[PDB]
Each structure stands twice: as structure tokens, then as C-alpha cells.
Design a protein around this ligand. Structure first.
Ligand SMILES: Nc1nc2c(ncn2[C@@H]2O[C@H](CO)[C@@H](O)[C@H]2OP(=O)(O)O)c(=O)[nH]1
Ligand SMILES: [Ca+2]
Ligand SMILES: [Ca+2]
Length: 104
């Protein structure tokens, strides 16, 4: 069973924790990777009901099981805050344009 289902992509809790640790470390260091400057500020335009506090940051979680290092991000993202608390696992898959839906 999947802990998070992002369209067709399957993630476990360990996949989420590994991607999140990698994202937070780059956030702490003031460093970014890729063309869309990951991790950046997630403004919550969709208005998701995240249990943890604002400011939020989006980072790519990959279907390959590899940590994001540049190039193509895919459609899947881990959302974390300033305290390294996970807000949610979101995806562009099944949402119009660059909008996001929550991973089930
Ligand atoms: N849909 C969405 N995009 C966001 C949000 N915060 C920042 N973005 C950025 O706003 C722009 C339009 O959606 C994109 O560059 C996108 O970055 P990403 O492509 O990296 O998600 C948000 O809360 N929702
Ligand atoms: Ca996995
Ligand atoms: Ca995008």
C-alpha cells in the first residue's frame, strides 16, 4: 500500500522523509537547484488545510526514489515549513495548468 498516491506515483513515508531532509538542508543553507529555484516559497493559492504553520516551502519528490538535484522536477512535491514539519504531499497531476491537488 501507498502512504501517498500522486496520480499514478506511489510514495511511502520513508520517501517523504528523505525528500524533506534534502529540501530543508538546502533551505537552511540558502541554496537552490534547478530552473524553478527549488526549494522556494509555497504561497498556498489553493488554500489547503495544513495542520502546521506558515511559511511553507515546496520541494520535488521523485518517482525514481532519487533525491532532486536539478533538471526535470516532475509533478510531485513535498511541502514543509520553517520548523522542518511536513505540511503535505501535493501534485500538479490531475489539476489544471500549474494548480495543485493533494496526494491521497
Ligand atoms: N499553484 C501554485 N503555484 C505556486 C504556489 N506558490 C508558488 N507557486 C509558483 O507560482 C507559479 C504558478 O502556479 C509557479 O512558478 C509556481 O511554482 P512551481 O511551478 O514551482 O510550483 C502556490 O501556492 N500554488
Ligand atoms: Ca519508494
Ligand atoms: Ca511548475
Amino acid at each position: 500500500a501507498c502512504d501517498y498516491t500522486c496520480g499514478s506515483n506511489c510514495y511511502s513515508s520513508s520517501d517523504v522523509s528523505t525528500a524533506q531532509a534534502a529540501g530543508y538542508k538546502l533551505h537552511e543553507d540558502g541554496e537552490t537547484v534547478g530552473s524553478n529555484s527549488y526549494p522556494h516559497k509555497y504561497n498556498n493559492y489553493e488554500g489547503f488545510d495544513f495542520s502546521v504553520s506558515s511559511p511553507y516551502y515546496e520541494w520535488p519528490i521523485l518517482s525514481s526514489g532519487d533525491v532532486y538535484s536539478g533538471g526535470s522536477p516532475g509533478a510531485d512535491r513535498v511541502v514543509f515549513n520553517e520548523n522542518n514539519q511536513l505540511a503535505g504531499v501535493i501534485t500538479n497531476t490531475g489539476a489544471s495548468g500549474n494548480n495543485f491537488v493533494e496526494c491521497t
